[PDB]
Scaffold this motif. Structure first.
Motif, PDB file in Angstrom:
ATOM      1  N   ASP A 160       7.849   3.795 -13.389  1.00 46.70           N
ATOM      2  CA  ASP A 160       7.442   2.412 -13.200  1.00 46.70           C
ATOM      3  C   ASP A 160       7.712   1.959 -11.769  1.00 46.70           C
ATOM      4  OD1 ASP A 160      10.314   2.306 -13.866  1.00 46.70           O
ATOM      5  OD2 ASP A 160      10.034   0.124 -13.798  1.00 46.70           O
ATOM      6  N   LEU A 161       8.848   2.360 -11.205  1.00 46.98           N
ATOM      7  CA  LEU A 161       9.185   1.987  -9.833  1.00 46.98           C
ATOM      8  C   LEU A 161       8.323   2.737  -8.825  1.00 46.98           C
ATOM      9  CD1 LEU A 161      13.029   1.609  -9.705  1.00 46.98           C
ATOM     10  CD2 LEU A 161      11.273  -0.111 -10.086  1.00 46.98           C
ATOM     11  N   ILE A 162       7.998   3.979  -9.152  1.00 49.65           N
ATOM     12  CA  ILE A 162       7.167   4.798  -8.297  1.00 49.65           C
ATOM     13  C   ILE A 162       5.774   4.179  -8.272  1.00 49.65           C
ATOM     14  CG2 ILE A 162       6.095   7.053  -8.066  1.00 49.65           C
ATOM     15  CD1 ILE A 162       8.652   8.195  -9.406  1.00 49.65           C
ATOM     16  N   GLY A 163       5.289   3.779  -9.448  1.00 57.33           N
ATOM     17  CA  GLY A 163       3.978   3.156  -9.559  1.00 57.33           C
ATOM     18  C   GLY A 163       3.887   1.843  -8.795  1.00 57.33           C
ATOM     19  N   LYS A 164       4.983   1.084  -8.806  1.00 57.97           N
ATOM     20  CA  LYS A 164       5.054  -0.189  -8.108  1.00 57.97           C
ATOM     21  C   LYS A 164       4.984   0.057  -6.597  1.00 57.97           C
ATOM     22  CE  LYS A 164       7.695  -4.514  -7.759  1.00 57.97           C
ATOM     23  NZ  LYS A 164       8.867  -5.397  -8.117  1.00 57.97           N
ATOM     24  N   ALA A 165       5.651   1.112  -6.133  1.00 57.78           N
ATOM     25  CA  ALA A 165       5.655   1.444  -4.713  1.00 57.78           C
ATOM     26  C   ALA A 165       4.274   1.882  -4.238  1.00 57.78           C
ATOM     27  CB  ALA A 165       6.679   2.523  -4.421  1.00 57.78           C
ATOM     28  N   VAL A 166       3.615   2.726  -5.025  1.00 63.83           N
ATOM     29  CA  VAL A 166       2.289   3.211  -4.664  1.00 63.83           C
ATOM     30  C   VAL A 166       1.249   2.080  -4.699  1.00 63.83           C
ATOM     31  CG1 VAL A 166       0.438   4.814  -5.274  1.00 63.83           C
ATOM     32  CG2 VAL A 166       2.815   5.558  -5.372  1.00 63.83           C
ATOM     33  N   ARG A 167       1.411   1.142  -5.630  1.00 62.26           N
ATOM     34  CA  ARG A 167       0.488   0.018  -5.716  1.00 62.26           C
ATOM     35  C   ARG A 167       0.636  -0.839  -4.469  1.00 62.26           C
ATOM     36  NH1 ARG A 167       2.537  -2.449  -9.737  1.00 62.26           N
ATOM     37  NH2 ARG A 167       2.959  -0.859 -11.339  1.00 62.26           N
ATOM     38  N   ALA A 168       1.853  -0.906  -3.941  1.00 61.72           N
ATOM     39  CA  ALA A 168       2.116  -1.683  -2.743  1.00 61.72           C
ATOM     40  C   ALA A 168       1.471  -1.037  -1.521  1.00 61.72           C
ATOM     41  CB  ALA A 168       3.606  -1.835  -2.534  1.00 61.72           C
ATOM     42  N   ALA A 169       1.717   0.255  -1.331  1.00 66.98           N
ATOM     43  CA  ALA A 169       1.167   0.993  -0.193  1.00 66.98           C
ATOM     44  C   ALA A 169      -0.358   0.946  -0.171  1.00 66.98           C
ATOM     45  CB  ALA A 169       1.639   2.437  -0.231  1.00 66.98           C
ATOM     46  N   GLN A 170      -0.958   1.082  -1.348  1.00 67.00           N
ATOM     47  CA  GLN A 170      -2.397   1.061  -1.465  1.00 67.00           C
ATOM     48  C   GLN A 170      -2.961  -0.315  -1.167  1.00 67.00           C
ATOM     49  OE1 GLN A 170      -3.479   4.449  -4.786  1.00 67.00           O
ATOM     50  NE2 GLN A 170      -2.676   2.476  -5.497  1.00 67.00           N
ATOM     51  N   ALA A 171      -2.315  -1.352  -1.680  1.00 60.20           N
ATOM     52  CA  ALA A 171      -2.793  -2.711  -1.454  1.00 60.20           C
ATOM     53  C   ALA A 171      -2.648  -3.152  -0.009  1.00 60.20           C
ATOM     54  CB  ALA A 171      -2.070  -3.683  -2.358  1.00 60.20           C
ATOM     55  N   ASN A 172      -1.584  -2.694   0.635  1.00 61.51           N
ATOM     56  CA  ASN A 172      -1.309  -3.065   2.012  1.00 61.51           C
ATOM     57  C   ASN A 172      -2.263  -2.513   3.066  1.00 61.51           C
ATOM     58  OD1 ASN A 172       0.780  -4.596   0.995  1.00 61.51           O
ATOM     59  ND2 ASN A 172       2.280  -2.937   1.226  1.00 61.51           N
ATOM     60  N   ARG A 173      -3.052  -1.506   2.710  1.00 63.09           N
ATOM     61  CA  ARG A 173      -4.013  -0.955   3.654  1.00 63.09           C
ATOM     62  C   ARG A 173      -5.432  -1.435   3.347  1.00 63.09           C
ATOM     63  NH1 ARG A 173      -2.330   3.782   1.351  1.00 63.09           N
ATOM     64  NH2 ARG A 173      -3.673   4.818  -0.212  1.00 63.09           N
ATOM     65  N   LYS A 174      -5.539  -2.463   2.512  1.00 62.74           N
ATOM     66  CA  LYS A 174      -6.826  -3.037   2.146  1.00 62.74           C
ATOM     67  C   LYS A 174      -7.210  -4.082   3.192  1.00 62.74           C
ATOM     68  CE  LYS A 174      -7.647  -0.725  -1.531  1.00 62.74           C
ATOM     69  NZ  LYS A 174      -7.005   0.603  -1.767  1.00 62.74           N
ATOM     70  N   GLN A 175      -8.489  -4.121   3.569  1.00 62.36           N
ATOM     71  CA  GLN A 175      -8.981  -5.058   4.587  1.00 62.36           C
ATOM     72  C   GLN A 175      -9.422  -6.405   4.038  1.00 62.36           C
ATOM     73  OE1 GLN A 175     -10.930  -1.710   7.665  1.00 62.36           O
ATOM     74  NE2 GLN A 175     -12.098  -3.523   7.045  1.00 62.36           N
ATOM     75  N   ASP A 176      -9.166  -7.464   4.804  1.00 57.93           N
ATOM     76  CA  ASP A 176      -9.562  -8.815   4.419  1.00 57.93           C
ATOM     77  C   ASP A 176     -11.075  -8.934   4.477  1.00 57.93           C
ATOM     78  OD1 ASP A 176      -6.792 -10.465   6.080  1.00 57.93           O
ATOM     79  OD2 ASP A 176      -7.071 -10.013   3.954  1.00 57.93           O
ATOM     80  N   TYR A 177     -11.657  -9.672   3.535  1.00 57.70           N
ATOM     81  CA  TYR A 177     -13.100  -9.863   3.519  1.00 57.70           C
ATOM     82  C   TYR A 177     -13.442 -11.209   2.906  1.00 57.70           C
ATOM     83  CZ  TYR A 177     -13.091  -8.866  -1.474  1.00 57.70           C
ATOM     84  OH  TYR A 177     -12.838  -8.954  -2.821  1.00 57.70           O
ATOM     85  N   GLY A 178     -14.712 -11.576   2.984  1.00 52.04           N
ATOM     86  CA  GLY A 178     -15.152 -12.843   2.440  1.00 52.04           C
ATOM     87  C   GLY A 178     -16.510 -13.191   2.996  1.00 52.04           C
ATOM     88  N   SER A 179     -17.292 -13.933   2.222  1.00 58.10           N
ATOM     89  CA  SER A 179     -18.619 -14.324   2.663  1.00 58.10           C
ATOM     90  C   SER A 179     -18.530 -15.383   3.749  1.00 58.10           C
ATOM     91  CB  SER A 179     -19.441 -14.841   1.485  1.00 58.10           C
ATOM     92  OG  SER A 179     -18.776 -15.906   0.843  1.00 58.10           O
ATOM     93  N   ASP A 180     -19.609 -15.508   4.516  1.00 58.07           N
ATOM     94  CA  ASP A 180     -19.726 -16.473   5.597  1.00 58.07           C
ATOM     95  C   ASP A 180     -19.352 -17.859   5.069  1.00 58.07           C
ATOM     96  OD1 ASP A 180     -20.878 -18.323   7.536  1.00 58.07           O
ATOM     97  OD2 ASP A 180     -22.110 -16.653   8.223  1.00 58.07           O
ATOM     98  N   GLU A 181     -18.397 -18.515   5.712  1.00 56.93           N
ATOM     99  CA  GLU A 181     -17.977 -19.839   5.273  1.00 56.93           C
ATOM    100  C   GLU A 181     -19.082 -20.893   5.222  1.00 56.93           C
ATOM    101  OE1 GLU A 181     -13.840 -21.276   6.452  1.00 56.93           O
ATOM    102  OE2 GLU A 181     -13.782 -19.206   7.204  1.00 56.93           O
ATOM    103  N   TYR A 182     -20.185 -20.635   5.922  1.00 55.67           N
ATOM    104  CA  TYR A 182     -21.319 -21.553   5.977  1.00 55.67           C
ATOM    105  C   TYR A 182     -22.594 -21.068   5.303  1.00 55.67           C
ATOM    106  CZ  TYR A 182     -19.273 -25.225   8.869  1.00 55.67           C
ATOM    107  OH  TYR A 182     -18.568 -26.322   9.324  1.00 55.67           O
TER     108      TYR A 182
END
Ligand SMILES: [Cl-]
Ligand SMILES: [Cl-]
Ligand SMILES: [Cl-]
Ligand SMILES: [Mg+2]
Ligand SMILES: [Mg+2]
Ligand SMILES: [Mg+2]
Ligand SMILES: [Mg+2]
Ligand SMILES: [Mg+2]
Ligand SMILES: [Mg+2]
Ligand SMILES: [Mg+2]
Ligand SMILES: [Mg+2]
Ligand SMILES: [Mg+2]
Ligand SMILES: [Mg+2]
Ligand SMILES: [Mg+2]
Ligand SMILES: [Mg+2]
Ligand code: NA
Ligand code: NA
Ligand code: NA
Ligand code: NA
Ligand code: NA
Ligand code: NA
Ligand code: NA
Ligand code: NA
Ligand code: NA
Ligand code: NA
Ligand code: NA
Ligand code: NA
Ligand code: NA
Ligand code: NA
Ligand code: NA
Ligand code: NA
Ligand code: NA
Ligand code: NA
Ligand SMILES: [Sr+2]
Ligand SMILES: [Sr+2]
Ligand SMILES: [Sr+2]
Ligand SMILES: [Sr+2]
Ligand SMILES: [Sr+2]
Ligand SMILES: [Sr+2]
Ligand SMILES: [Sr+2]
Ligand SMILES: [Sr+2]
Ligand SMILES: [Sr+2]
Ligand SMILES: [Sr+2]
Ligand SMILES: [Sr+2]
Ligand SMILES: [Sr+2]
Ligand SMILES: [Sr+2]
Ligand SMILES: [Sr+2]
Ligand SMILES: [Sr+2]
Ligand SMILES: [Sr+2]
Ligand SMILES: [Sr+2]
Lengths: 115, 246, 119, 145
Positions: B29-51
């Motif tokens: 469970d702790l190993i899974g929590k650590a890997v979920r963190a590492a994976q999430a932390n290398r994800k890029q921010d995104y979003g549609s044009d504000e206008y």
RNA sequence: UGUAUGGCAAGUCUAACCGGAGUAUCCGGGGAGGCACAGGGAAACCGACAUGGCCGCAGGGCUUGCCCGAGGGCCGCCGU
RNA sequence: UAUGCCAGCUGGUGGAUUGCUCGGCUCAGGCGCUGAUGAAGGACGUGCCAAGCUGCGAUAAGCUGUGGGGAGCCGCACGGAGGCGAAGAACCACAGAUUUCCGAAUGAGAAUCUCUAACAAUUGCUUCGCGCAAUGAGGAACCCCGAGAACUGAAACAUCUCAGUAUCGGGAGGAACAGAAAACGCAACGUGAUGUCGUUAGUAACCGCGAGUGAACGCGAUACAGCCCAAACCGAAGCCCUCACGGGCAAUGUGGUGUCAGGGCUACCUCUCAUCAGCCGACCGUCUUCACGAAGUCUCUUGGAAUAGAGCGUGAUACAGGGUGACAACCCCGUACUGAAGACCAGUACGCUGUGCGGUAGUGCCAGAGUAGCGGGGGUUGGAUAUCCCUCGCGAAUAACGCAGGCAUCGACUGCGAAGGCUAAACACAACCUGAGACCGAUAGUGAACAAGUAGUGUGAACGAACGCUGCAAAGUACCCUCAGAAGGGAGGCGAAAUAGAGCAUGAAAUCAGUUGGCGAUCGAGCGACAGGGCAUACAAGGUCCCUUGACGAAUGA
């Protein structure tokens, strides 16, 4: 529901003893562990020194912490001890895991529940 | 306990004490929590044009022409979420924090626990790795760091009866779904992790599914890819020692 | 770039001189040994053998090389139109192998023989 | 499955009548609006109270109860061992960024202690002296007069 | 502001940033600062129960009603 | 059974769905000014045939040179005619030539044309002549200086708030601005230019003390850098133009000295390596581009086609990604490794030349005025008596003096010298280059994957779409019949497939034609649910069902 596989097993074992052997504390401790973590016991040494007596295992349905002074030569059984708790306890007694207590004393005799 | 060292030929060459960390109780469970963190932390921010969808002076005619009060421009509805070409009501936002925090003690414990999962042949086999062996992790001498050819590392692995795991990872899967259109067409099984001390094995890195690392910075992910503990690993005499104080 | 759209984009939009590499074919065993190269830019004089299409197995002289479409016309590799006129069936050079070269060009022969460069 | 996840199909998403979740009227105004009128309940009463002294004229003392010292005498092996003697200034954390160190007298003193600090409470003395101890006021501590 | 789970615990967490590297991940460093470890008083200023009594659930004990009774409950007393 | 109802079947219609991605969206690194030497933008031209787009400019999809590149080529765009290229074309990099008209638009005027040499206009220098120069306009936002709302919130509303926001005027750069203390005030035996980031802190402070508003010192970091005048004392020792000659400036002071480690002057000790001016001038790193670069296209089976299945084999510092007739490390481009170039860092760092740092004593020689400060009225701010600023009036001292330390005055104490000036780096933005993605996948994502700011609307400001997919290969349908027929139709040819035949992958629903089953011209309307009958049904994916009799046999019960 718990997520820690160890705590999960400890509870299963506490039950197996409460049922098989004559221990009624193991099932009592199991029931408290199954309850929310916030209700679990966080006990410092000053409390063990006040209410514990020799030749009577101290059973903590939670974790033992290192605040205060312990002089009595007692055996403390808990889910976990802080690094300092285990250290202070062993200087004048013996810190033991619940998993050990269940094996040594499956009948759960001569034991004081502390929180 | 003790770990048996192996020379570059596959023969035993003494043995050292398997460090205490490999005795750390496995905590998936702790190993899974650590890997979920590492994976999430290398994800890029995104979003549609504000206008997007807001570039119009469209207006609603209100009551009177037997039509819904929907903003229109040149006869066509606009802006509003229910209109074709309208804005997205609640779209992805760049402002969103897509990272995950993890207490150092919690993450350091996951590393140790993951490290320990390596020393369990049943766990390693449970994880999915293919090999005919008892002692694990596979400990090898420091001279391994001087190998240059990949083909030579192959021979050493066949000698150690651990090469079957590479035949396992020698099958690329062509993923289902549009990830393909974004450069994620393929994927393959994770095979052997090679932990060295001075530099990551350039010789072993190209092996199918292999991952190379160094004792000082080997992390939870390479130790337990996907958060699944017990990866077939091979340490170096010095790596094995250096990993003890992690 | 590792991104597919960019890969395809750069290949479809490469300038003429960069399109040469899009009409390269593998060399025969004897030629690879003779020139120390695995492949070469198919020329309109070279002889080639078809390794893949419906024409696989056929040999012929390269009649044309189009850099724009990146394909070649090999002799006898044709299709019969409705009127009966046989027309060339273009081939991708990657489905073809060079068996004989046309070395009339001093420059081409030079590149083939030089060790520091390729053709 | 979460509460949010079960909403599709409910129409109102728990808000009751669909006439409910509209604007700020459903809240009785924006922010703390009506804190002295319709929503006066459970709000601290209106008004000014007291005064504040300027920040740079204010003194901040670093404090410690005898209980904390006494409970760590053995653990404080890196300090003086007389017939124990401890200079509180070296024990209290955040003693630098504080005007002075003061020993408070909460708990018991089961040892003979010789404590040195800028200040002591009546209780701190009584407890330390009454247990075969002594209290040494620092030079800075010579403020009492 | 709750709650569930998890880590550590009289403590706990690092922020910007720095070094490394497999270079947005990640390993190491960084405790500045925050919250907790005492409160009361506008302020000046002062500064507390590591337990004194009774009841008693769970649990334990005994020669099977009688003892010990964490938590809890009722009081005492302590700081301002 | 007509009209007709329900379901299905064949064929349409329609274009959903699935698959696909030349476009988007977002993040990240790099880089960053253009213009009177006429920009940016626009107009009109320019091709063998040329409408659109792109390019280009009367030398008009181009001309020259050097380098690369290479047997091909003549843009998007596959035609016909023709031509070019080994005299090395195409294509790419750098450099250069040409470069119409309007346009800041500058001789004057004008809806892109015209009239009779032009820096128009405003300035500086000046041979006082437009002779030499400057300004103007553009740029995605960022930046700096000015002007400055309202909806809204306060459940009304006026102060307050929205907000110094939107919008407006002016202006610079590749970054701006700021900046070497008349500072701070953890009050100290302390810190030591400035931005910025984290924190201090929703703290202090403000406020119909309502709603709300809201710092700083400090600390941890980033980057670090410190100097020049005015005057004293000198007094033409000086500067600009010109090859020179010679001219211009300058006593209303050019130039030396000097700048709080105060300085000058006088008398002294010693010394310089500070500073300032100037010469030389990078490594590395980073971004981009390029060179080189290993190994199967072997057997059988299926297929229209092997990148599939099975069998045998190989590389790997390369098992990223793409292409190729189906799933490819080894077929092709690439990828690892190594190497090269350009750009940025940067005319910076290091080095060098020159200068000379400093100290003691004496000396009331010098040290920025409508200033410091006070009052009236306003704005602004967290700034409260204690923010910053504007306006009107008043108004000081001279270092032996002055200002600050969050109310005023006097004294003490501590700090510090205003009313002159410059200043690298660390930070903002994203035009431009490149990279990336748990982003979208053609009613989505940009308005725009397509002719996209296109077609089109409005006098104008402005507004503004829709349209992606034949096939492995055009093999894009010869011949014949029919017909008014280059139409359409029939037959026929190609292909694995034409129900792949041109808005041509797939091809849903609504719905239409024909047709099958059930109902049907004496009969009643939420269209059904549950029971039970008729009639209908190829296989597959369900295999049960009926009657005699017998066994079991709850409540109930003759
Ligand atoms: Cl406790
Ligand atoms: Cl106060
Ligand atoms: Cl300070
Ligand atoms: Mg949209
Ligand atoms: Mg799907
Ligand atoms: Mg060669
Ligand atoms: Mg004119
Ligand atoms: Mg209102
Ligand atoms: Mg009100
Ligand atoms: Mg404000
Ligand atoms: Mg301040
Ligand atoms: Mg000078
Ligand atoms: Mg205001
Ligand atoms: Mg669209
Ligand atoms: Mg179709
Ligand atoms: Na628009
Ligand atoms: Na309608
Ligand atoms: Na974010
Ligand atoms: Na509602
Ligand atoms: Na401090
Ligand atoms: Na701290
Ligand atoms: Na740039
Ligand atoms: Na044209
Ligand atoms: Na030009
Ligand atoms: Na001019
Ligand atoms: Na003139
Ligand atoms: Na209101
Ligand atoms: Na109103
Ligand atoms: Na107000
Ligand atoms: Na091929
Ligand atoms: Na005034
Ligand atoms: Na001050
Ligand atoms: Na579309
Ligand atoms: Sr009306
Ligand atoms: Sr072309
Ligand atoms: Sr073309
Ligand atoms: Sr609710
Ligand atoms: Sr609304
Ligand atoms: Sr009221
Ligand atoms: Sr601190
Ligand atoms: Sr920590
Ligand atoms: Sr109690
Ligand atoms: Sr500095
Ligand atoms: Sr001055
Ligand atoms: Sr005062
Ligand atoms: Sr459409
Ligand atoms: Sr109109
Ligand atoms: Sr036909
Ligand atoms: Sr009838
Ligand atoms: Sr019966």
């Amino acid at each position: 529901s718990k997520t820690n596989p160890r705590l999960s097993s400890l509870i299963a074992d506490l039950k197996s003893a409460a049922r098989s052997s004559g221990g009624a504390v193991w099932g009592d401790v199991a029931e408290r562990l199954e309850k929310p973590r916030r209700t679990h016991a966080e006990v410092n040494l000053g409390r063990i020194e006040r209410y514990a007596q020799e030749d009577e295992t101290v059973v903590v349905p939670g974790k033992v912490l290192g605040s205060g002074v312990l002089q009595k030569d007692v055996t403390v059984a808990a889910v976990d001890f802080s690094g300092t708790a285990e250290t202070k306890i062993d200087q004048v007694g013996e810190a033991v895991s619940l998993e050990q207590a269940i094996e040594n004393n499956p009948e759960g005799s001569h034991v004081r529940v502390i929180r | 306990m003790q770990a048996t060292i192996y020379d570059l030929d596959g023969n035993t060459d003494g043995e050292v004490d398997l460090p205490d960390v490999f005795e750390t109780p496995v905590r998936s469970d702790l190993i899974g929590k650590a890997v979920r963190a590492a994976q999430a932390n290398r994800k890029q921010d995104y979003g549609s044009d504000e206008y997007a969808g807001l570039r119009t002076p469209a207006e609603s005619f209100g009551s009177g022409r037997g039509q819904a009060h929907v903003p229109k421009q040149d006869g066509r509805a606009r802006r509003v979420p229910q209109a074709v070409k309208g804005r997205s009501a609640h779209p992805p936002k760049t402002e969103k924090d897509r990272s995950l925090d993890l207490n150092d003690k919690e993450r350091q414990l996951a590393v140790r626990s993951a490290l320990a999962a390596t020393a369990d042949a049943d766990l390693v086999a449970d994880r999915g790795h293919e090999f005919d062996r008892d002692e694990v992790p596979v400990v090898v001498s420091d001279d391994f760091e001087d190998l240059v050819k990949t083909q030579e590392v192959v021979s050493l692995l066949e000698a150690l009866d651990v090469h079957a795991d590479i035949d396992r990872a020698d099958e690329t899967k062509i993923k289902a779904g549009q990830g393909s259109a974004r450069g994620r067409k393929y994927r393959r099984p994770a095979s052997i992790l090679f932990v060295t001390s001075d530099e990551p094995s350039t010789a072993a890195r190209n092996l199918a599914g292999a991952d190379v690392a160094t004792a000082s910075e080997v992390n939870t992910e390479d130790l337990a890819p996907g958060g699944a503990p017990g990866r077939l690993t091979v340490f170096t005499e010095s790596a094995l020692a250096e990993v003890a104080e992690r | 770039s590792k991104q597919p759209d960019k890969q395809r984009k750069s290949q479809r939009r490469a300038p003429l001189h960069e399109r040469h590499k899009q009409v390269r074919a593998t060399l025969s065993a004897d030629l690879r040994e003779e020139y120390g190269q695995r492949n070469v830019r198919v020329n309109a004089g070279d002889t080639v053998e078809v390794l893949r299409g419906d024409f696989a197995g056929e040999e012929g002289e390269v009649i044309n090389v189009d850099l724009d479409k990146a394909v070649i016309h090999v002799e006898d590799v044709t299709l019969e139109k409705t009127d009966g006129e046989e027309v060339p069936r273009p081939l991708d050079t990657s489905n073809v192998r060079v068996t004989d070269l046309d070395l009339e060009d001093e420059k081409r022969e030079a590149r083939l023989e030089s060790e520091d460069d390729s053709a | 499955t979460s509460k949010k996840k079960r909403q599709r199909g409910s129409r109102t998403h728990g808000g009751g009548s669909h006439k409910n979740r509209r604007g700020a009227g459903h809240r009785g105004g924006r922010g703390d609006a009506g804190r002295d009128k319709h929503e006066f309940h459970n709000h601290e009463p209106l008004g000014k109270s007291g005064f504040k002294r300027p920040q740079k004229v204010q003194e901040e003392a670093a404090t410690i109860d005898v209980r904390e010292i006494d409970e760590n005498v053995t653990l404080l092996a890196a300090d003086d061992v007389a017939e124990f003697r401890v200079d509180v200034r070296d024990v209290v954390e955040e003693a630098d960024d504080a005007d002075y160190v003061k020993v408070l007298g909460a708990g018991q003193v089961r040892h003979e202690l010789t404590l040195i600090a800028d200040d002591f409470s009546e209780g701190a003395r009584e407890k330390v002296e009454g247990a075969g101890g002594s209290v040494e006021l620092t030079d800075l501590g010579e403020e009492r007069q």
